[PDB]
Amino acid sequence: GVLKIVKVYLAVKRRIQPGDKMAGRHGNKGVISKINPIEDMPYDENGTP
Amino acid sequence: FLKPRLVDIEQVSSTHAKVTLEPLERGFGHTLGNALRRILLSSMPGCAVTEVEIDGVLHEYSTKEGVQEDILEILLNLKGLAVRVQGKDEVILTLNKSGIGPVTAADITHDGDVEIVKPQHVICHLTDENASISMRIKVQRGRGYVPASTRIRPIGRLLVDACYSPVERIAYNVEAARVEQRTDLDKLVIEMETNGTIDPEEAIRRAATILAEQLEAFVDL
Amino acid sequence: VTEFLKPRLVDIEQVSSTHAKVTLEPLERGFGHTLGNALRRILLSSMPGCAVTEV
């Protein structure tokens, strides 16, 4: 019942977004509440946020 | 009061540099340090790659023959590549390499205005002898981080998200200075780790100008 | 690229002579916290004023 089938593949790059589910290996699972700016992030005395 | 001045600028390396602000009262130094760190990290003039055009491949996922890694990996490597442009807000960089061997940033054909900060940086590896890659690298002066999706034409053209953040980390430590007859005065020292596109003293000057302009909103100049 | 969005305050809300509220709408992403912290610490740590110290 079909003549020809056209298959088209969409490649979508999914940036990490608020609301995505983030889970460690130990079982701590949680959503990303907000993408905080780099300046807002806490930093140690070395300066790495 | 006392007004701090750029008494010393020290470069432990090309990427890592230290700037010192000697005269500062108690409390002023730490406030200025936090404000300068936030301003420097938030927004500085940057020249990260914006879009890359590959002669041989249409989209980033499909790969070209004779290239060790994927075109997507090439784009993300080019994102790490950083340049500094003296006079043009817009510049086009052309890369051509033939034969076996890594394709370093030094191999990029460069104009007089645009200079590659780190020639040792490698974009791709041409494993095959009869393999040639031709790249048109588009670099736009910008502020902060812009995602690729947020911006916006030919099918061959590839868009890579740009990161106009010349400074990677900014660490400031407040240590007391030693003035001949004074007390409660400390020198602010800022450790700047940058890709090298922006001069440390120039970056401090730009951050101070931005902060002063923002403050001029609160009270008339 | 050197240009920035410079805030234009819409109101300066005053409840009493001693207590006032100041708000600036546009500012910039991350600039609000920087300016607020800077002003707060600068006017707590150092302000030209005279108070009673010895009785």
Give the CATH number of the domain where residue B119 resides. Answer: 2.170.120.12
CA dihedral of B160, B163, B168, B171, whole degrees rounded to 10: -160
Measure the CA–CA gap between B148 and B166, rounded to whole angstroms: 18
A24 interfacial to chain B (CB closer than 8 Å):
no
In C, which residues are within 8 Å of B211 by CB distance?
34
User: Nearest to residue B168, comparing CAs of B71, B12, B40?
Assistant: B40
Say how many residues make up chain A.
49
Whether B149 and A15 lie within 8 Å, measured CB to CB: yes
Whether A43 and B38 lie within 8 Å, measured CB to CB: no
Residue B51 in tokens? 């879009």
CA distance A9 to chain B (A): 12
Residue A46 in tokens? 């070395």
DSSP notation for C12-53: EEESSSS-EEEE-SS--TTHHHHHHHHHHHHHHH--------
- For tokens 């003039």, what's the residue? B45
Q: Which of C34, C39, C42, C45 to mutate to test the interface with B (most CBs of B within 10 A)?
A: C34
CA distance A44 to chain B (A): 8
A37 interfacial to chain C (CB closer than 8 Å):
yes
Q: How far is CA C6 from CA B213, C23, C29, in A?
A: 8, 13, 12
Q: How far is CA A3 from CA A6, A9, B38, B152, in A?
A: 10, 20, 62, 38
Residue C32 in tokens? 């609000």
Whether C6 and B213 lie within 8 Å, measured CB to CB: yes
Give the three-state DSSP class for B66: coil
For chain C, how big is the Rg over CA atoms in Å?
16
Q: Does an H or E element contain B53, and which?
A: strand B49-54
What angle is formed at CA C51 by the lines to CA C45 and CA C55, rounded to 5 degrees?
125
Measure the CA–CA gap between B13 and B192, rounded to whole angstroms: 10
In A, which residues are within 8 Å of C34 by CB distance?
39
For chain A, how big is the Rg over CA atoms in Å?
20
Residue B145's closest chain A neighbor by CA?
A37
Select the residue of A37, A39, A47 nearest B191 (Cβ to Cβ). Answer: A47
CA distance C7 to chain B (A): 6
User: Nearest to residue B51, comparing CAs of B60, B42, B43?
Assistant: B60
B157 and B136 in contact (C-beta within 8 Å)? no
A34 interfacial to chain C (CB closer than 8 Å):
no
DSSP notation for A1-49: --S--------------TT-EEE-TTS-EEE------TTTS---TT---
Method: cryo-EM
Whether C2 and B217 lie within 8 Å, measured CB to CB: no
> Domain containing B74: what range?
45-164
Interface of C with A (CB under 8 A): 29-30, 33-34
- For tokens 């905080």, what's the residue? A36
B108 and B120 in contact (C-beta within 8 Å)? no
Whether B42 and A37 lie within 8 Å, measured CB to CB: yes
Measure the CA–CA gap between C17 and C15, rounded to whole angstroms: 7
Select the residue of B26, B142, B213 nearest C4 (Cβ to Cβ). Answer: B213
- CB burial of B207-219 (b: ≥16 within 10 Å; e: otherwise) equals bbebbeebeebee
Resolution of the experimental structure, in angstroms: 3.7
Residues 6+ apart with CB under 8 A from B183: none
Strands B157-159 and B167-176: unpaired
Q: Euclidean distance between the first and final Cα of chain B, in Å?
A: 19
Whether A40 and C33 lie within 8 Å, measured CB to CB: yes
Q: Does an H or E element contain B211, and which?
A: helix B200-218
CA dihedral of B209, B211, B213, B217, whole degrees rounded to 10: -170
Q: Which of B1, B3, B25, B31 to mutate to test the interface with C (most CBs of C within 10 A)?
A: B31
B55 and B17 in contact (C-beta within 8 Å)? no
